[PDB]
């Protein structure tokens, strides 16, 4: 019977902000906007208040384990857990950024894969029955999968892969870039794309454990692509507004209590894609 709660990571701008706004109107309970920068997060909450909405705020940097754990403790204390988690935070380097490629790989992987993973380690145990988890991946993960060796494709499509095996492979990509050997070892050229392979596969693994370990709790967990969205990441020439980009993530967050699925899927335009 307690009040329900939804939370979005990377909520101060871009798709994440639009997701928060829609959950404020459509989610029955509190909605927590989180942001790594407290100033930007509070400004975004003030923006939504000027629109008539009442999100809560909590700081969260998915790359700081102490930030994650403080949020965990807040959720336990204030709500006794969590109903909806949207792992939206992510980064990408632009074309021709002068940062060395192996550092771009390390940095992008650190946030998009390892930060996401650490949020899930701490917050998935808090998800309540009928909860939903939404991981914002990218269609670039499907695109990058095709460019992997056959051996890595089999590993990434496996229904038996463990989280610890995936972790090893994600770190292997990054180390291989530093050694100048990633393509020889079967990896694609796109570092961002490999990080999103990690998000997609992590989603599949976490869904399988939910089915294995929490039969009966009616939790649904999926990965998704929001499409090509005008944000600071993609720039102003992209196809969709943030409002449009939010639609598939919000759909997946708000799947009705009696939904049988999707679960463990990669979803774009509200439709399941083959992995
Ligand atoms: N735009 C697009 O076309 C597409 C985007 N995506 C994915 O959608 C998600 C949102 O992207 P988008 O809105 O475009 O990007 P933006 O750059 O506009 O927004 C990214 C959000 O993530 C936050 N963030 C980044 N790193 C961290 C971190 N360490 N801890 C907490 N928050 C963090 C940012 O905070 P801050 O303001 O402090 O930087 C910001 O709130 C990402 O996962 C992206 O990979 C997928 C497909 C397409
Ligand atoms: C119907 C939903 C809940 C998606 N929605 N969206 C919006 C909306 C409209 C314009 C921009 C935006 O971000 C959201 C909205 C509104 N203004 N009033 C009532 N419901 C609204
Ligand atoms: C630059 C192109 C047009 C190839 N692009 N970029 C993206 C893109 C931009 C930023 C992040 C991301 O994951 C993907 C994209 C997309 N989601 N769908 C279709 N085309 C896309």
Author numbering: 2 to 276
From the paper:
The carbonyl reductase CBR1 was first isolated from brain and has been associated with two cellular functions: (1) detoxification of xenobiotics, such as the anthracycline daunorubicin and (2) metabolism of ketone-containing cellular messengers, such as prostaglandin E. Genetic studies that have intended to uncover the in vivo function of this enzyme have focused on the xenobiotic detoxification activity of the enzyme. We used affinity purification to identify a target of hydroxy-PP, carbonyl reductase 1 (CBR1), a short-chain dehydrogenase-reductase.
The structure was solved by molecular replacement with the AMoRe program using a modified porcine carbonyl reductase model and refined with SHELXL to 1.24 Å with a crystallographic R-factor of 10.3% and a free R-factor of 13.4%. Although NADP(H) was not present during purification of the enzyme from E. coli nor added to the crystallization experiments, one molecule of NADP was found to be bound in the CBR1–hydroxy-PP structure. The phenolic hydroxyl group of hydroxy-PP, however, points deep into the substrate-binding pocket and interacts with Tyr139 and Ser193 of the catalytic triad. The phenolic oxygen is positioned 2.5 Å from Oη of Tyr139 and 2.5 Å from Oγ of Ser193, thus indicating strong hydrogen bonding. Importantly, the structure of CBR1–hydroxy-PP provides a molecular understanding of the basis for the strong dependence of CBR1 inhibition on the presence of a hydroxyl moiety, as this functional group serves as a key interaction determinant with the catalytic machinery of CBR1. The binding mode of hydroxy-PP in CBR1 also explains the tolerance of the pyrazolopyrimidine core to derivatization at N-1, which allowed attachment of hydroxy-PP to solid support and affinity purification of CBR1. Importantly, structural analysis of the hydroxy-PP–CBR1 co-crystal structure revealed a small space in the active site capable of tolerating a methyl substituent at this position.
